[PDB]
Design an enzyme around this catalytic site. Structure first.
Site, PDB file in Angstrom:
ATOM      1  N   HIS A  45      37.947  44.911  32.728  1.00  0.00           N
ATOM      2  CA  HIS A  45      37.586  45.236  34.095  1.00  0.00           C
ATOM      3  C   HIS A  45      36.918  46.598  34.143  1.00  0.00           C
ATOM      4  O   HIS A  45      36.992  47.388  33.209  1.00  0.00           O
ATOM      5  CB  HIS A  45      38.806  45.181  35.032  1.00  0.00           C
ATOM      6  CG  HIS A  45      39.746  46.337  34.931  1.00  0.00           C
ATOM      7  ND1 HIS A  45      40.398  46.807  36.049  1.00  0.00           N
ATOM      8  CD2 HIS A  45      40.156  47.102  33.902  1.00  0.00           C
ATOM      9  CE1 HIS A  45      41.195  47.803  35.699  1.00  0.00           C
ATOM     10  NE2 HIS A  45      41.066  48.006  34.399  1.00  0.00           N
ATOM     11  N   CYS A  67      39.675  53.452  35.031  1.00  0.00           N
ATOM     12  CA  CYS A  67      40.843  53.030  34.287  1.00  0.00           C
ATOM     13  C   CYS A  67      40.820  53.613  32.887  1.00  0.00           C
ATOM     14  O   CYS A  67      39.759  53.779  32.285  1.00  0.00           O
ATOM     15  CB  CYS A  67      40.870  51.511  34.220  1.00  0.00           C
ATOM     16  SG  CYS A  67      42.341  50.837  33.400  1.00  0.00           S
ATOM     17  N   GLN A  88      48.679  43.293  39.073  1.00  0.00           N
ATOM     18  CA  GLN A  88      48.690  43.260  40.528  1.00  0.00           C
ATOM     19  C   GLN A  88      48.158  41.908  40.994  1.00  0.00           C
ATOM     20  O   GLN A  88      47.243  41.328  40.389  1.00  0.00           O
ATOM     21  CB  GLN A  88      47.857  44.401  41.071  1.00  0.00           C
ATOM     22  CG  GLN A  88      48.491  45.750  40.827  1.00  0.00           C
ATOM     23  CD  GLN A  88      47.504  46.868  41.046  1.00  0.00           C
ATOM     24  OE1 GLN A  88      47.711  47.725  41.903  1.00  0.00           O
ATOM     25  NE2 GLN A  88      46.450  46.895  40.240  1.00  0.00           N
ATOM     26  N   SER A 114      45.007  49.779  43.098  1.00  0.00           N
ATOM     27  CA  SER A 114      44.324  50.679  42.174  1.00  0.00           C
ATOM     28  C   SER A 114      42.971  51.100  42.713  1.00  0.00           C
ATOM     29  O   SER A 114      42.482  52.195  42.390  1.00  0.00           O
ATOM     30  CB  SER A 114      44.124  50.015  40.804  1.00  0.00           C
ATOM     31  OG  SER A 114      45.362  49.835  40.169  1.00  0.00           O
ATOM     32  N   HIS A 156      37.780  46.404  41.629  1.00  0.00           N
ATOM     33  CA  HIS A 156      37.620  45.939  40.257  1.00  0.00           C
ATOM     34  C   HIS A 156      36.436  45.001  40.163  1.00  0.00           C
ATOM     35  O   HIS A 156      36.220  44.186  41.061  1.00  0.00           O
ATOM     36  CB  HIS A 156      38.861  45.155  39.738  1.00  0.00           C
ATOM     37  CG  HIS A 156      40.137  45.899  39.909  1.00  0.00           C
ATOM     38  ND1 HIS A 156      40.768  46.504  38.853  1.00  0.00           N
ATOM     39  CD2 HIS A 156      40.928  46.104  40.992  1.00  0.00           C
ATOM     40  CE1 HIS A 156      41.850  47.118  39.282  1.00  0.00           C
ATOM     41  NE2 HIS A 156      41.991  46.871  40.576  1.00  0.00           N
TER      42      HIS A 156
HETATM   43  C1  LIG Z   1      45.090  45.786  36.268  1.00  0.00           C
HETATM   44  C2  LIG Z   1      46.404  45.881  36.998  1.00  0.00           C
HETATM   45  O1  LIG Z   1      46.707  45.118  37.916  1.00  0.00           O
HETATM   46  N1  LIG Z   1      47.223  46.877  36.593  1.00  0.00           N
HETATM   47  C3  LIG Z   1      48.488  47.156  37.156  1.00  0.00           C
HETATM   48  C4  LIG Z   1      49.481  46.183  37.155  1.00  0.00           C
HETATM   49  C5  LIG Z   1      50.708  46.466  37.738  1.00  0.00           C
HETATM   50  N2  LIG Z   1      51.720  45.529  37.727  1.00  0.00           N
HETATM   51  C6  LIG Z   1      50.904  47.713  38.336  1.00  0.00           C
HETATM   52  C7  LIG Z   1      49.900  48.662  38.349  1.00  0.00           C
HETATM   53  C8  LIG Z   1      48.661  48.400  37.772  1.00  0.00           C
HETATM   54  C9  LIG Z   1      47.565  49.428  37.789  1.00  0.00           C
HETATM   55  C1  LIG Z   2      45.386  50.468  31.423  1.00  0.00           C
HETATM   56  C2  LIG Z   2      45.249  49.995  30.009  1.00  0.00           C
HETATM   57  O1  LIG Z   2      45.760  48.957  29.631  1.00  0.00           O
HETATM   58  N1  LIG Z   2      44.511  50.798  29.214  1.00  0.00           N
HETATM   59  C3  LIG Z   2      44.104  50.590  27.871  1.00  0.00           C
HETATM   60  C4  LIG Z   2      43.669  49.337  27.455  1.00  0.00           C
HETATM   61  C5  LIG Z   2      43.262  49.153  26.144  1.00  0.00           C
HETATM   62  N2  LIG Z   2      42.832  47.920  25.710  1.00  0.00           N
HETATM   63  C6  LIG Z   2      43.296  50.232  25.263  1.00  0.00           C
HETATM   64  C7  LIG Z   2      43.720  51.475  25.686  1.00  0.00           C
HETATM   65  C8  LIG Z   2      44.134  51.683  26.997  1.00  0.00           C
HETATM   66  C9  LIG Z   2      44.598  53.037  27.434  1.00  0.00           C
END
Ligand SMILES: CC(=O)Nc1cc(N)ccc1C
Ligand SMILES: CC(=O)Nc1cc(N)ccc1C
Ligand SMILES: [Cl-]
Length: 147
Positions: free
Chosen positions: A43, A97, A115, A138, A141
């Site tokens: 995303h 992100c 989410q 957030s 997206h």
């Molecule tokens: C991509 C996404 O939905 N991420 C997320 C998931 C949850 N459960 C809480 C907070 C975030 C940011």
């Molecule tokens: C929010 C989240 O999942 N972030 C993330 C995803 C990948 N694939 C690698 C590194 C990070 C920090």
């Protein structure tokens, strides 16, 4: 009589029918055809001042309005759809992100983990398909389903 979430729509400017998905906010001229335990998505997130955490690796204090965030999202979608830019390049440069550093990849996930609007859009996309603007706490997206 269309895949999950699709409806016929009428272009205001051209008069031509198109298809809109109210789960993914995708829109397209072509008629869509057609649930996995898990999907994989990338995303591009644009945050705004009302984001759960209005702060990112890009900006200590995210001050843009939701309207401004949506204009940015719209512009990225346009460039991805035109081929002027690739999704992965825009995510790396401009996603608020931390996953920007992995070209937006979030890896695989099942229902219950993300989410809900993000989850719903993700599972309604076909493999390889991209969403329209998807709103969560957030921010906004662009979602690419990769698996
Ligand atoms: C991509 C996404 O939905 N991420 C997320 C998931 C949850 N459960 C809480 C907070 C975030 C940011
Ligand atoms: C929010 C989240 O999942 N972030 C993330 C995803 C990948 N694939 C690698 C590194 C990070 C920090
Ligand atoms: Cl983080």
């Amino acid at each position: 009589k269309l895949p999950p979430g699709w409806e016929k729509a009428m272009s205001r400017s051209s008069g031509r029918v198109y298809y809109f998905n109210h789960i993914t906010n995708a829109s397209q001229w072509e008629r869509p055809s057609g649930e996995p335990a898990r999907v994989r998505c990338s995303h591009l997130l644009v945050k705004h001042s009302q984001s759960r955490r209005p702060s990112s690796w890009r900006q200590e204090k995210i001050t843009r309005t939701k309207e401004e965030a949506l204009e940015l999202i719209n512009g990225y979608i346009q460039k991805i759809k035109s081929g002027e830019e690739d999704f992965e390049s825009l995510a790396s440069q401009f996603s608020d992100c931390s996953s920007a550093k992995a070209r937006g990849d979030l890896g695989a996930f099942s229902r219950g983990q993300m989410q809900k609007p993000f989850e719903d859009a993700s599972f309604a996309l076909r493999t390889g398909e991209m969403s329209g603007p998807v709103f969560t706490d957030s921010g906004i997206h662009i979602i690419l389903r990769t698996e």
